[PDB]
Amino acid sequence: PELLGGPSVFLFPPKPKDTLMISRTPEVTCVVVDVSHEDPEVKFNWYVDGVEVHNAKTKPREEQYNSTYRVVSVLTVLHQDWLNGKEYKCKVSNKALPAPIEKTISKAKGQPREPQVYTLPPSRDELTKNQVSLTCLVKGFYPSDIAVEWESNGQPENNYKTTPPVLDSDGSFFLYSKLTVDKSRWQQGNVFSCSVMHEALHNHYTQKSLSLSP
């Protein structure tokens, strides 16, 4: 039983923002690593809910730094197909494999839940410092695929971090996004907006604003 050996396959979902904006192009990406020079030919078969499709684009072999080849096949997906839970299967055939390798991916199952989005001004204790933290609390959403952005006056904010989604006790997820801004910009009354994109929101987004006001 020396079946052991040969390439490996990793199948990756689309970016959450790409499934939610009809503008953007969501893709599932099938990556084959540990392809040898002796057996370099890789064949991809793609199936959507069991029925084969033929519109995937395969990039050419790329020699990695460990002297193995890496081959990638990118399948463009329909927004609604992914969001409706259709399964995406990648089947990889190569002479060094005793049988093709099959990987299947899909959206997480379960009834979607709308996030609640709450913006929180900086703590008064933080106003003594040169930069303040603007906080966007996003809770109660399912599945955990989500995208959060900050903007002000039609331009993106250059300085925010967002925690990973964290499982809450009710089965839903929550996260926080911390926008950092100069104290002067906050005290001068600029408006800052938290934009949250999630499939369970109307038009796949909501946004809440935050500005200094006494």
Partner: protein, 262 residues
Amino acid sequence: APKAVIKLQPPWVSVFQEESVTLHCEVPHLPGSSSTQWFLNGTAIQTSTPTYHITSASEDDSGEYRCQRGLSGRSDPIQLEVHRGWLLLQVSSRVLTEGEPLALRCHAWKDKLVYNVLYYRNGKAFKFFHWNSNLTILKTNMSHSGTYHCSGMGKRRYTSAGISVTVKELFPAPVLTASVTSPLLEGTPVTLSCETKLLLQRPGLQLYFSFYMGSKTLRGRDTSSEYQILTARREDSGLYWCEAATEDGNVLKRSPELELQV
């Protein structure tokens, strides 16, 4: 009398604890009914047969082996290391001269199985095998010098320790001279040279030179180092290239194109 020569069977200079290896003392004078002197790190070994067999290696077997038979000179040392580990990078020699083949093996403790093996030189994996396989480099050169190790997948991914291999250069790029003057009055005696010399003490080794024009020949592989057209008409003008190589051709090197104007 020439020197004795030690040979390892298997040829690997590093083995695992409790593994077996046989040392062969070869003398070109083939003797009969004559003893063999074996030395571990200068100390004489209580074994006098023409081969010396280690049945189950241990740390006490590591060091320099030398041997001597009859009226031969004592051999150059072979260094045997005994190791413990998951994986052992075995090499056929630790030092080589350009052109001499190098053999490599990614040896698994107790001959267990690994797959998806990588061979590394100086931190970078240069060769990948789905099934564990030895690796031989026939035309070695200086760039094959470095630290070698390997890794493979068993129940987990295991990695061997490093071992150093030096591939010594034999002669540099045979640069081509320019006799005096370029440009020149045609009707002037030529003299052209090929600038390379040996770096190792090879007693009777002879290098063979050959001078080029563009691509077509002038003088083939000859033991003399200088091309000398009697006195130059600039038909023999323009591209000039030299090539120096061993008699077997397994080490050959280039040179810059000579500005020639007669």
